[model samples]
Target: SEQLKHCNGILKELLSKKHAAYAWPFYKPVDASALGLHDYHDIIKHPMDLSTVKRKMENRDYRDAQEFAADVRLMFSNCYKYNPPDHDVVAMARKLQDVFEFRYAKMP
Candidate 1:
């Protein structure tokens, strides 16, 4: 229970970070057609986002803290895969990913 609650806190923090202009891109699933990124799906095999993580947390779909963190990281991983390192969205994801790691390490 302790670790689960801590992980949930980390997720909530990340979700709130979505208010940042660059972070908005990661809050929801990417619309490939709308964005004109036809190859997005081809590059990112596993798509993830903050909203999806929130839904998983709400439904208690995660088996443990590790799984919860993995899903959070998965969202960043997908961003990196679909965007270049020099991209603004990638930079924002990096900042949020660092925050997640910092908070995750404190889990009891």
Candidate 2:
């Protein structure tokens, strides 16, 4: 309960419009089949997204703040792996990660 409050607060801000422009692509899991990216699964061993993290939080799956923070970081890492450094999504991931880090660093 204690850590959950701080995690939830960060999530709320993370989803806000200030980060939404770069955050849209990360709202859900990658659709490899639908998007025709067959190699996606082979490349990204761990798939993480904001929605999945939110669900895990609601289900009380996180053991601590570190665990929650790790998943958020994993989401960006997955993006970096699937997309090239020059890609727009990579830039988006970088900015969104910054927003998360700022709030995460100040977490209670």
Candidate 3:
């Protein structure tokens, strides 16, 4: 219960800093190789992009639907912190989902 407050605070912080620094949620993979001297972990910079979507489509990173669902939930948790004034982001997301589904669904 108490922990959620801190989590929520961080979510809102990103929104305020988004435009100022192109801030967004990022999942960076660690690299332990020669000539790579950097800490690559939990790097936040920008939202998802075309390549990530393509990657997901070509091959889902998560093992299954449950894993995928968890991923979405985390990303959407900050939806309310959007510049549009902390609204339920999933509702907007739902609208987008419906639009895409209707347009892309195969016609039998």
Candidate 4:
């Protein structure tokens, strides 16, 4: 549970940022398996794939910004576990946050 707690803490920090809504859409508690490295490539390789939940965050019809924030938070949180020491996670998180802040956060 320490890992999840640590992850949640990270997510909290990320969520506090203004762009959190663009990065994710839901905020449910997660387990270790959620952070597993296996299949991680699936999301990156096919970001538009229907099965990829991140695509839901990109949908205009789904205007649940709060839920999107939570989902992005969860995705980044689990990313830490999969690649704890990798700097790419931090970079990617920042990029995602920026995308949300600049693009999706204030759409009409």
Query: Of the candidates shown, which would achieve the greatest TM-score relative to the real structure?
Result: 2
RMSD in Å for all candidates: 1.6, 1.0, 14.9, 13.0
Candidate 4's C-alpha runs over 4 A off are 1-51, 54-63
TM-score of each: 0.91, 0.94, 0.31, 0.37
Per-residue CA lDDT of candidate 3, range 1-108, in tens? 233333233323333443223333222221324426242223323334223433553463545433433443434433433325433434554443343334333222
Q: Is candidate 2 or candidate 3 better by TM-score?
A: 2
Candidates 1 and 3, the one with greater TM-score: 1
Poorest stretch of ten by lDDT in candidate 1: 14-23
Off by over 4 Å in 3: 1-54, 84-91, 94-108
TM-score of 1: 0.91
Task: Tell me, by lDDT, which candidate is best.
Answer: 2
Residues 1-108, candidate 2, lDDT per residue (tens digit)? 677789988887787888788999999999999999999999999999999999998899999999999999999999988888999999999999998898888876
Model 4, span 6-73: residue lDDT tens:
33343444445564454333233322356674565643432221123433433443345554555554
Number of clashes found in candidate 1: 0
Pairs clashing within candidate 1 = none
Model 2 regions more than 4 Å off: none
Better of 3 and 4 by lDDT: 4
Worst 10 residues of 2 by lDDT: 11-20
The deviation in Å at residue 81 for candidate 4 is 3.8
Per-candidate Cα lDDT values, in order, are: 0.84, 0.90, 0.36, 0.45
Best-to-worst order by lDDT is 2, 1, 4, 3
**For residues 11-45, could you state the per-residue lDDT of candidate 1 as single tens digits?**
77776745466567778898999999999999988
